[PDB]
Every structure is written in structure tokens, then in C-alpha cells.
Design a binder for this molecule. Sequence first.
Ligand SMILES: [Mg+2]
Ligand SMILES: [Mg+2]
Ligand SMILES: [Mg+2]
Ligand SMILES: [Mg+2]
Ligand SMILES: [Mg+2]
Ligand SMILES: [Mg+2]
Ligand SMILES: [Mg+2]
Ligand SMILES: [Mg+2]
Ligand SMILES: [Mg+2]
Ligand SMILES: [Mg+2]
Ligand SMILES: [Mg+2]
Ligand SMILES: [Mg+2]
Ligand SMILES: [Mg+2]
Ligand SMILES: [Mg+2]
Ligand SMILES: [Mg+2]
Ligand SMILES: [Mg+2]
Ligand SMILES: [Mg+2]
Ligand SMILES: [Mg+2]
Ligand SMILES: [Mg+2]
Ligand SMILES: [Mg+2]
Ligand SMILES: [Mg+2]
Ligand SMILES: [Mg+2]
Ligand SMILES: [Mg+2]
Ligand SMILES: [Mg+2]
Ligand SMILES: [Mg+2]
Ligand SMILES: [Mg+2]
Ligand SMILES: [Mg+2]
Ligand SMILES: [Mg+2]
Ligand SMILES: [Mg+2]
Lengths: 149, 77
Amino acid sequence: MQVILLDKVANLGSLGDQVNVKAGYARNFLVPQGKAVPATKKNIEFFEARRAELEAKLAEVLAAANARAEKINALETVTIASKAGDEGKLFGSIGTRDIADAVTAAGVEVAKSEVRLPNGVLRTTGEHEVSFQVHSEVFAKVIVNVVAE
Amino acid sequence: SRVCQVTGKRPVTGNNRSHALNATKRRFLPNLHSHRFWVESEKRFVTLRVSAKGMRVIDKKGIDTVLAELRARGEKY
RNA sequence: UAAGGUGAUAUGAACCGUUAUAACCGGCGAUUUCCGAAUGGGGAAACCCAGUGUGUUUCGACACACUAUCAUUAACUGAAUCCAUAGGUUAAUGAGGCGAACCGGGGGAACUGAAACAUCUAAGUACCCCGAGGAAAAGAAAUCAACCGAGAUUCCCCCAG
RNA sequence: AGGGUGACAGCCCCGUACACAAAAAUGCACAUGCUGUGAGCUCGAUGAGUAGGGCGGGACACGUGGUAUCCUGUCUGAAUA
RNA sequence: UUUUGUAUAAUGGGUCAGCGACUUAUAUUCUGUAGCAAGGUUAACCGAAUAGGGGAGCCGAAGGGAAACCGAGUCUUAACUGGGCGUUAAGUUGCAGGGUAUAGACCCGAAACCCGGUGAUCUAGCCAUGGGCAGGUUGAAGGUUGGGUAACACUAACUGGAGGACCGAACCGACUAAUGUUGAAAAAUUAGCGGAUGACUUGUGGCUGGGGGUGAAAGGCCAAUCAAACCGGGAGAUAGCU
RNA sequence: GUUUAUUAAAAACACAGCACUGUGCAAACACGAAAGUGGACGUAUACGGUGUGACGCCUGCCCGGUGCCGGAAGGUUAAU
RNA sequence: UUGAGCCUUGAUGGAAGUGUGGACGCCAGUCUGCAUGGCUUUAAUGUUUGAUGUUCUAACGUUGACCCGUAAUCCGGGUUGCGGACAGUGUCUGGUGGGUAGUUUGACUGGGGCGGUC
RNA sequence: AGCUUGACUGCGAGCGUGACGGCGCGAGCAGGUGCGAAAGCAGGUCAUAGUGAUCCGGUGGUUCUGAAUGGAAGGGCCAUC
Ligand SMILES: [Mg+2]
Ligand SMILES: [Mg+2]
Ligand SMILES: [Mg+2]
Ligand SMILES: [Mg+2]
Ligand SMILES: [Mg+2]
Ligand SMILES: [Mg+2]
Ligand SMILES: [Mg+2]
Ligand SMILES: [Mg+2]
Ligand SMILES: [Mg+2]
Ligand SMILES: [Mg+2]
Ligand SMILES: [Mg+2]
Ligand SMILES: [Mg+2]
Ligand SMILES: [Mg+2]
Ligand SMILES: [Mg+2]
Ligand SMILES: [Mg+2]
Ligand SMILES: [Mg+2]
Ligand SMILES: [Mg+2]
Ligand SMILES: [Mg+2]
Ligand SMILES: [Mg+2]
Ligand SMILES: [Mg+2]
Ligand SMILES: [Mg+2]
Ligand SMILES: [Mg+2]
Ligand SMILES: [Mg+2]
Ligand SMILES: [Mg+2]
Ligand SMILES: [Mg+2]
Ligand SMILES: [Mg+2]
Ligand SMILES: [Mg+2]
Ligand SMILES: [Mg+2]
Ligand SMILES: [Mg+2]
């Protein structure tokens, strides 16, 4: 009586791991009460075909837009800027919709402040390349050209 | 009728054989139990009079395959 | 098929026949009370008592048919529990009981023999029980052989007391 | 062959050897029809709570013996040309 | 017949007639006989059927040794002067017979053991439902009233109507005696006898079944029988006995 | 009162009463491979077993043996 | 909780001063950690593996109550309650076991038995 | 009393005595030994009691056997319990 699991399960559980349990516990609780299933071999592929068509399938189905920054490896046209101030230095800040203004016509159009650098956002030269939130892993690269008027 | 619904196991006959090697008629008879199996396929408790082993066979072949027999054999369940 | 016939004890009676419906024989049909598996219920077998449909220039009532149980199927229904299952009625098919031996299986003695007696024998005999056929059962190698080969089962003679 | 006829019958009677016969119902054969029914080729697949094992019994001529082989009440349990 | 021995006063037989006990099958040996003879003979089966086929096989012509093996020899032992068993006599197949073996094995006969059925119409116990007990006694509790006590106690009449209570028919039983004892009867009659409102008696019907029932317990009763019923079967049990 | 129906009716059996002992109820016990059932529609002032056998006055000593009751050390000890 | 193994972080194989529990400590040491201040002898976890004990439910018991099949003291399904991996049953096993069973329990013998003998 | 192990191993003409199973006596032959200078003597004790068939099983020896073959298990033979 090996059986493979469904939900979690106390001292063995794991959504589908390979356990070997006392027969009783199974035919008396686990199964007929949806929590396990006989390791009928027919099944050890029926639930391994997932361990492959998933943990190495949909974990690769993630990689189809590398860095997401594909052909944007040469910066983007500077439509406007992101502001300035302090007669030489910097003074103005990025409203909850103002890092787009420059890269405001490239990829797709949005408007949210998934802030990444919890600082007073340094006030100097202008053009910088950090990362910003493009996803739960990758990044991106562009610059920032000010406006002289 | 001491008879295992899944494996036909009835009681059998034999001797006892002492040290003096004395024949005495007797019976061997099944470890039967009648157990409440949950089916799901039927949302019900079919409860067969089963011998351990018959148990082991349900645990292997599968209740749906066992009740498949019987049905196909004439038996109640 | 026919010139004689109506079985016997068993005559007699009243009749039937003789060239084709006398009788006799044979093939197929009809009729087939009651009791009996017995099956509408019951029951001290051959009796008692029903329900539902019918039916009468006298449509009271009394005659005629169906109504057992079980299983497979189907239709219509239908609980605790709303679905569903269980249950319920109806219908179509089948079964039921009887009987020689032979046969397959379930179970299975003892006297006896061993010059007592327990292992052993009598014996898987007697007997009980279930099932089937014209036969049953077995059967087309996870068989034997023995370095050559054989080629299912069943039966017979040897092997061999 | 046999039986019967007032005693022992080839030739008296019934038979016997032999040769013939059925409107019907059936049996078995064939030759056909009906409902079925599947045929041949190629590519596959090749019988698990099973075989084996402990324990207890029972079958094998074999009475556990040094005991292969078979069935299985009980507990277990493989390989896969 | 049985016996050391039987007229024996030990057995059996009233007499007649009929019936009534060493058989059959298969093996195996021997004798007799017949064929063939170092050979003899086939079984199943085939069949042109008492022929003919079929020689599978069986016995015999070679033993010795536990055996491997050797072989008219072999074995024993390191080997035997030797010793044991063998080499020197023909077999085999029918047929009849004598024995034996396996079978009922010359015939009849147990008490019993085992299996399956049939029996509580007799009887024991119990369950349901019904009947029965002439007549005559004794006279418990309780009650009333008197007397009585300070009151209860106590006490006298009455009243009442208990009881495995008394005597005695029916009914149930069966203690003594005589008769009967090829009876009137397979437990009776007769004179006497115990119970007789109860743990009574009885009718109908029902339940319990054989190593079981039932039993106020005698091993008693369970269809004229019971230290294990009756019927059928194993079964021709076995019988070193008559 | 019962009893050997049918050679024994008694001093035998029973008997009220007495004790010992088991039983908490799905009782113990008993019929029965079981199911089912009696005990009991009862429940320890009940139910079973054994012995004694109205009542009166009484019922002493012995626990080695046998039987039975209890004992969570040790010794010996089955399958496994 | 507990007997034993493995995996580990602390024992045998960013300095000096103002400060602490346990100790085979060669008999008089020094440690093993506690604060700071410009493959083999040792303790806890994660565990793997058996023993013991509490409890749990969800097998299994229910000769409690209720619902339906059902005008039903069977049964079955369902709900609830109590119990609960106990009880019980199958196989194996040691003990008991005249309750039942099958038997045995010699011969000689101036009858048998006793004695004696073989 | 000295030296010793003949209380040897294989056999045995030929006798006794038993229904039998069996027991018993035995010169002598071979191998090998002790005692004796030698002839010679010793295959237990002056003789006659001092015992237990067969089965099963144990132990030592031994290719004799050994189920396809090689082995082994078991069996035989000898010795012994
Ligand atoms: Mg009728
Ligand atoms: Mg009827
Ligand atoms: Mg006997
Ligand atoms: Mg005998
Ligand atoms: Mg057939
Ligand atoms: Mg080949
Ligand atoms: Mg295959
Ligand atoms: Mg005399
Ligand atoms: Mg004279
Ligand atoms: Mg005389
Ligand atoms: Mg005279
Ligand atoms: Mg005569
Ligand atoms: Mg009566
Ligand atoms: Mg009176
Ligand atoms: Mg009187
Ligand atoms: Mg009188
Ligand atoms: Mg007596
Ligand atoms: Mg009688
Ligand atoms: Mg009889
Ligand atoms: Mg017989
Ligand atoms: Mg009296
Ligand atoms: Mg009498
Ligand atoms: Mg009398
Ligand atoms: Mg009492
Ligand atoms: Mg007394
Ligand atoms: Mg007294
Ligand atoms: Mg006393
Ligand atoms: Mg006895
Ligand atoms: Mg004698």
C-alpha cells in the first residue's frame, strides 16, 4: 500500500508525492475521502506525467520573452523627460504616473507606481539605469533625457 | 454462509493430527469480516462480507473493479 | 386393413357390419373432472374459501378465464434525503416437480484387517447432499524424455505385485 | 428357424428364405434458402495478490522422510523473453 | 455328536416328503496328460472371427556379488593351503486335478459398531384450552357485644369460615392375602387398603427425538422392549466358539 | 407428597427451612457450528449451581494431601 | 516521554583588562560556555528506528433514541448518542479439559482370585 | 616376579547342539606381534551364568550406488552406539 497524495496531508503530505502508508489509514480514511490513491502504476505516470508536463514544462513556458527587454537593447526615443529643478540641481518628483512621460510611447501604455527604490530618489545628472518592475525576475534597460525649455 | 463475497473463500475440511498422529475431522474457515467500503462512484457505502485478503484484493484491484465482478457474476452487493 | 364385430372374469341383452366411415392396427389432432410441483388463499391430498374481468326476449345470481414464488428484462411509479439509490405495481420470457443406471462435485463412517490396539486398514467404500449429459468428465504441454527423440485427452494390454 | 392343429407335420394353419410398402409424423444424412455468424493478411498484444515463501492441513502408490510435484485455511509476495 | 471314555440318567432328532453346506473368479506352485523343445507361448487388438494376423511381453537357456562389476565362474580376504553360492538333470503353453493367496471362500448363528430415516396416538415433563370432586366433621384469622383495665393487655359469648386439616363415595392410587399362573387377563379378579380443595384428578390439541428427550432420581419412562428406541442400510460385520 | 408402568412404596426422592458458591444485566447458566432463544419482559429481598433437609438445643479441633481462591519478584516455558 | 543510529551546530583525535553556571577536573591545574571594551570518549535539535503512556476517530461494537422503506418487537438504509482500534472473529500457539470419545488393563494357576512365578 | 598386549586381523578341515533364529568346540592356513636359549605357548580369564532378534535412528570408514549430466542429498557395504 504505497498510494500517491492529493491535498497536503499531515506527516507525509505533498500535493502528489510518493508515500508508502499503513493500509488502514488508506482504505478507511485517506482514499474514500479524497486524499490519496493506490500507486497502481497506471497512476505513477498519470501523476508523473505532471511532474514532467509542468515542473519542466510550464517552468519553461515562462521563458518566451527573455528579460522582456528584447529589441529595446538600444534605449528608447526620448519624447520628453522626467523633470528637473533647483536651478541646476534637481527638485521635482515623479508623480504616481511620471516615469513613462519619456518612454511614454514604446511598449504598451500603462500607469502605475510599482516603486522599486525606497529612497529619496537621488537628485543629480539625470540619466540612470536601475531596473524597475518588469516581472518577478527579469529587468530592463533605458535612459532619461531632460527638457531644456 | 461463511463465504467471502470477493474470493469465494468458504470453509474447508481437514484432520487435526495429534502427536500420536491421530486423525480428527475439523474445519479451516475464512477470516471474514463484512466491511463498509466507500465507493464514490456510487456515493454510497456498499458493505460486503469480505475475508481479509479479499480485502487485500479490493485494495489492489479496486472496489469499482470488484463490485464490477459480482454485478457481472449475479451477486447482490 | 378387412368379413366380421361392441377389451376381460362373463354368458346373455340390445345392436353394428359384409367392397368400404362395422371392427381392428398405425400417423396427427380433439376432449382430458378432482388431487398431486399444484401455482388465486387455505388445508387433516382428492376438500374449504376468495378477488378481479366478463356473460343471460328470466342480465337476481350462477357458469367461463385470469390472479403463486423466484430470476433476467422493460414500462409506469417512488422514501429517510432534493437529485439519486432503496422500495411499489404491471407486463414478456424462463425456472419449479418426477425418474433407472452411468457421470462431476460438496461432505463423509464404522464394524473389520493389523490374529489385542492407537499411527496404518477397511475407504474416499457405505450413506447424505448439489449439478449435468447422452454420455459425463478430461483435453491440445510452463508434458515427458535424456543429449537420440516424443508430441493433447480418454480407454485397453504390458511394464510389475 | 420356430409355434399351433384330437399322438412326433418341410407340403394343414401361422410363419420362415426372399421380395415389396406409407396419407401422415418423425430420425439421420446430405444438396439448398433464411436469420444469423464470423472468414483471410499485415502490425500488435501474450492471463499478479498470480508464481514463490512461513505456518496448518489435504492430494500425489510416497504415512515429513533426504521429498521434488499439486490444491489452499492463515499470513506474505516476484520476474515480465 | 463330543469324548480318555457314552446303552448312558451327556448332545440332536415326533414321523414323512422337498430343499439344505468345500463353490466361483484371478493369480501362483506341484502332479497327471497333450503339443512343441533350446525353446515354448503370445495380450490387447485386427479379423477374411473357435482360422489367420498381432510376439508388445512373459517364462526358460548363467551365475556370483549389497553393488560398480566380473562371468562358467564369482564372492570373501592383501591372498587364501581355502571357504560360500554356482557351472554336471529342459524348458514352456494348454487341459484336468492337488495346495496356497485375494475375495463372504464349506454352511447356518451373535451380543454388538457405524450411516440415514420413522416414532411422545403407550409413557415422563411442559405449554394452551375445557370438565370433575356424593355426604359428614373440625372451626384458624378477622369482626361485634359484654366483662375488664387509668388505657392497652386479658377474657366470655357470638360471629366468621382458614387448612398439601379430619371421616368417606365418585375419581386417582396400589399396602396385604387367596385365586389365576397351556389365565376370563401377555400384571386380571376377589376381600380388605392409601389419597380424596390439591404439590389433586381428567378431556382435546400442542412442544421435547436417541448418546437425545423427559425424569419429586428407579437407570425410571420414551407404542406389551431401554445401562442407549424402532426401521432401513454398511452387511454375507467379526465368531482362534458350538 | 413422589417413586422402580409390570416381584422393592421404604428408612430411598421431594419438601418448607439452612448454608456455601457464581452472577452488574448483551448476567451467570442452558438449547444451538450460527442466526435465534430460554433465564426474564426478571435485575442482587433476583436469577443459577452444590450440599443440608421442619423445629428445638447445637454444630469443636485440622489447610499436610487433593480441589478451589489470590499473588505486577524470580526460575522454567509456545508459536513467532 | 523514552532505548539506539544518522545531519548537524558548541567539546577529546578580529586583543588585553572591569565581570558568570557546570567539572572525570595527575592533588590542588585549567577549562566549557556564559558579558563585555578603544571514521571515536562529550549537550540540544532535525530527525530514522522500536518500547511505554495519554488522548483522538475514521475501521469495528451498540441487546440507547429517532427517521424512512412499513399500519412491522425481523431486517435494511439513514441521523443521533455511547464506546473505540478496545472488544470480538480467522489462522497459529502453550495451558486446562472423563464434558465427550476410542482403547488398553498379560499369561501360568490341581477352578478363579490373593500369593508366587515368567 | 620379569618382560608384555594373542583380550590380534583375515579364514577354517572337521565336530557338537538346536524345529528354527541361533549358540558352541576346533586343529590348521596367511599377515603381523609378545614371551622363551630352544622345543614351543598365546585368536582372554579352570570350565559351564553375567543377557536383548528385527525396525528406526546416530557416529567413524568406504565413489559401491547417486533418477538428464557433473556434483551433492539419500541409499549400500564395514565398524560401532
Ligand atoms: Mg389451489
Ligand atoms: Mg398451496
Ligand atoms: Mg474398533
Ligand atoms: Mg483388530
Ligand atoms: Mg463436455
Ligand atoms: Mg529437441
Ligand atoms: Mg502466456
Ligand atoms: Mg467329558
Ligand atoms: Mg458300552
Ligand atoms: Mg440319550
Ligand atoms: Mg432312559
Ligand atoms: Mg428328508
Ligand atoms: Mg397428549
Ligand atoms: Mg385433606
Ligand atoms: Mg378419606
Ligand atoms: Mg380391589
Ligand atoms: Mg442402582
Ligand atoms: Mg415399553
Ligand atoms: Mg438396526
Ligand atoms: Mg463391510
Ligand atoms: Mg404418604
Ligand atoms: Mg413394581
Ligand atoms: Mg408394590
Ligand atoms: Mg436458589
Ligand atoms: Mg439427606
Ligand atoms: Mg438427617
Ligand atoms: Mg464442622
Ligand atoms: Mg470413557
Ligand atoms: Mg489365565
